[PDB]
Design a protein around this ligand. Structure first.
Ligand SMILES: COc1nc2ccc(Br)cc2cc1[C@@H](c1ccccc1)[C@@](O)(CCN(C)C)c1cccc2ccccc12
Lengths: 238, 63, 61, 84, 84, 84, 84, 84, 84, 84, 84, 84
């Protein structure tokens, strides 16, 4: 009894369905991120030994700024730094919160998770990917003009490959979303399957898989942020 | 069914993300960039001060 | 319950691994960065004091 | 017999094909990218930092196909299209 | 027996084959192109930028096939040709 | 069983095989050609344009095969041979 | 059931296999030969005229293998042996 | 004819496909990564440790896919979705 | 129904598999051998002739397998063993 | 049509796929690792001693993938899941 | 429906798989060995006579496997184990 | 239909898959190992004597898997598990 899907806390509003579990997980991740941000704002110091949170935040900022400088000058695209930092920290926290021991028995032999990684929901990945898509297309329009930008994206580096380029433009958002989704969704299955073992055997495969899933989530967050940065760089040029 | 079908959840998630972005855009990245710039300026000032101390000592010895 | 017990034991193993073989190196890196920043601030302090001493010497001579 | 039985058998076989192809592609592409990374590090062992960015770009591009296939296999097997 | 069931099972198997092949091709081609990019960056760190233009000319093509297949797979399963 | 349904299922499976093989070939061939192009550009930047004439020949020969498969896929799927 | 339906489904599956294999072989072989050609031309411009001679020979042995398969698919799908 | 029999046969075939694809991908990717590791150790013996960090990453990225496939294969055979 | 129908469908599927494998092997082997030949001619323009004697051998061997498969496919398709 | 017969046929096909994939992966990965080892020993005769360390790791990571498949194959055909 | 018909169709498909795998393996292995031979002869022309000894070994092994498969294919299609 | 007929057809298809995968793996791995051996001998002719110890190991592993597959093929075909 895998019980794939089956969102809990589903409710209705404005003639639309909302998956309460995904909203709750996203809210918890946002609360954690905002708490870290305000703890930094309280303990940020340029004339003293940096605290752990300041070190972490400045490490992320330095990494993302280095990526931007490598791809497109920070002068051209300043906003990409906050956007990429937000994306990375959000995805990383959302994925790493899944390591906590919040899985139990559903009273029917099926595993139930109090907190599921929100990236396991198509809506979360779709929101992130579509926001990045619109943001970098708007940046391209700003840099190239409303008429110039579509011409440049259709033409690409080589003009006569205009069809392929078009597909590539549609390939960017989907690949940003599904990839993430997939690598998280699969994980959600794994734990559930591991929950079918007896308690005296479930611990070892569960421990191994979750220990590796920490690194997997870190890698996925980094990849999402880096791909967003280089998509912005491609959109904004010439 | 079809858990893969996009839902209204999408909009909700977006809003939350936007809020986080704002918090990052205003109270995380600008202060951190300012801290990094101040640290780099401090290092450059230290190097310049060392060089200026050296040259001033040399000039005092010479003149 | 059984699922909860198994996953709790798994989380205990995960925490043991992280504390034993992940926390030490990352804390070492954090301490190294803190020491680097502290040393930079100090070096700035002694550089300023050295420049003050050099200015005093120049004024004297 | 039950039409849904045949549809489900076909969906399971199709999902198996999807996942097998995705696994082959992911494994071979990740191996090739890791070979590039390891060879580059061996050539000049202090280039580790600057190679991880292109390596992870390659890894992301390779895993894109794998995890898109995983998502579509999940669609096939859990919400089968055209299932009567 | 419902003929639509046979047609739908065949369509699911065909879409599974399409995605398996697309995944294999995309993964291996992207891995190969990324291997080239990583080696070039390792040997010439200054090339970080100038190697993206050919790389993404390659990846694009490699992705194209995959996603083209994706479209047809959808057409196979969501609007099955020949399905009475 | 309607014979047309069996023929349609077979045609769909065959078209899926055609597209899978075409996608594998196109992806891997384009990846290899792009590896060659990226390596050539990395070794010497001035050759970029000079290398587009052969590279696009290779991609011309690879993609062509894919296209042919696609065409016949249509024949298999939209106007099925032998569909009584 | 009609024997012709089963025979036609089998013939379509066989033709799909034929073209899938042919496309895989043609694409990968053309990619490898083009990689050789691109690397050679990158090494020195003067070789471009000469290197195109062996290259075609390679493409002659590769593409030929494809087209033979293509021909046979026609035999499978248009004049099915043992169609009864 | 029990529909569960057909569903179980399809699930077994799909799980076999998943495991075969995972085995191919894992084996070839691990072989390629190990080839890079062996070549690096032969070229630069003192970089052995430095070369183990990327290698175990590649394996981690490769092996993981395998095990993911493995998990889903179990899901096919022990928790067959769509079982009636 | 007619035993010959099932036997002929199986024979066509088997012949399709045989030609798919033969085409894959022939294409990839010929591409690899031609890559070796092209690289050799590029590096050593004066080796043009000397590299045909080995290359042909390789091509011969590769082609051998392909054509052998072709023969057996005819045996599979035109004179099906075990037909009854 | 005994349900056990269909389930056993599906299990045998799945086990055959598992072993085919495992054999392909093991053979190709071992060949690549051995290529690395042979080249390293050829260029550095004295390196043999150390080169057996990474090699045995690579083979260990490849053969393992093989011998896991074996086990599950032994599970498919000797204790078939879902059998009744 | 004669059970011999089903058994013969299964045997034909199995023999087709055997020959397809053998053809792929033989073609690719012979191509790789010939690539090595051509590269070595280009590098060291006087080594030709010396390089044919290892080459004939490699091909030998490759060919061996192919031929073994062929033998078993003859067993599958001509004297099918399990006819009744 | 006779249950043993379906079981035997499935067993034959599974054995064909086993041998196809084993043949592909054996051929390609042997080709790669022989490529390494030939390249090593060409680079240093006198190294031949010491290059056979690793080569025989490589092939020794590769062939192992293949032969193991062969054994199980017999088990599938000559003593079919689950045969009624
Ligand atoms: C440009 O590339 C090409 N070059 C060729 C070279 C030689 C020959 Br003879 C045929 C060629 C055919 C094409 C494309 C084409 C362009 C336009 C129309 C028809 C076909 C292509 O087939 C490329 C597919 N590749 C990348 C896997 C394609 C097919 C289907 C859908 C596409 C969607 C988007 C882009 C390309 C799409």
């Amino acid at each position: 009894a895998i019980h794939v899907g089956h969102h809990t806390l589903v409710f209705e509003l404005f003639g639309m369905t909302f998956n309460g579990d995904t909203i709750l997980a996203t809210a918890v991740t946002a609360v954690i991120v905002i708490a870290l941000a305000f703890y930094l704002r309280a303990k940020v110091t340029s004339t003293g030994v940096p605290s752990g949170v300041q070190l972490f935040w400045e490490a992320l900022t330095i990494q993302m700024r280095q990526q931007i400088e490598g791809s497109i000058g920070m002068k051209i695209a300043p906003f990409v730094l906050p956007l990429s930092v937000t994306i990375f920290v959000f995805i990383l926290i959302s994925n790493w919160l899944a390591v906590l021991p919040l899985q139990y028995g559903g009273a029917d032999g099926a595993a139930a998770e109090l907190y599921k990684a929100p990236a396991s929901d198509i809506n979360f990945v779709l929101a992130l990917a579509l926001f990045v898509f619109v943001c970098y297309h708007a940046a391209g329009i700003w840099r190239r003009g409303i008429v110039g930008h579509p011409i440049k994206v259709v033409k690409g580096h080589v003009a006569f490959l205009a069809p392929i380029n078009i597909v590539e433009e549609l390939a960017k958002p989907i690949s940003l979303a599904l990839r993430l989704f997939g690598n998280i969704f699969a994980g959600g299955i794994l734990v559930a399957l591991i929950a079918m073992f007896p308690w005296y055997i479930q611990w070892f495969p569960n421990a191994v898989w979750k220990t590796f899933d920490l690194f997997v989530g870190l890698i996925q967050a980094f990849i999402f942020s880096l791909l967003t940065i280089l998509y912005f760089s491609q959109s904004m040029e010439l | 069914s079809n858990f893969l079908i996009p839902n209204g959840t999408f909009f909700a998630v977006l809003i939350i993300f936007l809020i986080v972005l704002g918090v990052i855009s205003k109270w995380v990245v600008p202060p951190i960039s300012k801290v990094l710039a101040e640290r780099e300026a401090m290092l450059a000032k230290t190097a310049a001060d060392n060089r200026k101390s050296a040259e001033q000592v040399a000039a005092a010895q010479a003149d | 319950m059984s699922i909860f017990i198994g996953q709790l034991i798994g989380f205990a193993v995960i925490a043991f691994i992280i504390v034993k073989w992940v926390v030490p190196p990352v804390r070492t890196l954090m301490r190294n960065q803190q020491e680097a920043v502290r040393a930079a601030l100090a070096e700035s302090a002694e550089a300023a004091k050295k420049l003050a001493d050099a200015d005093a010497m120049h004024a004297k001579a | 017999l039950d039409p849904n039985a045949i549809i489900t058998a076909g969906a399971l076989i199709g999902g198996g094909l999807i996942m097998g192809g995705g696994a082959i592609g992911a494994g071979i592409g990740d191996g090739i990218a890791g070979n590039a990374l390891i060879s580059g590090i061996a050539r000049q062992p202090e280039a580790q930092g600057r190679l991880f960015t292109p390596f992870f770009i390659t890894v992301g591009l390779v895993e894109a196909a794998y995890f898109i296939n995983l998502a579509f296999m999940a669609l096939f097997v859990f919400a089968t299209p055209g299932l009567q």
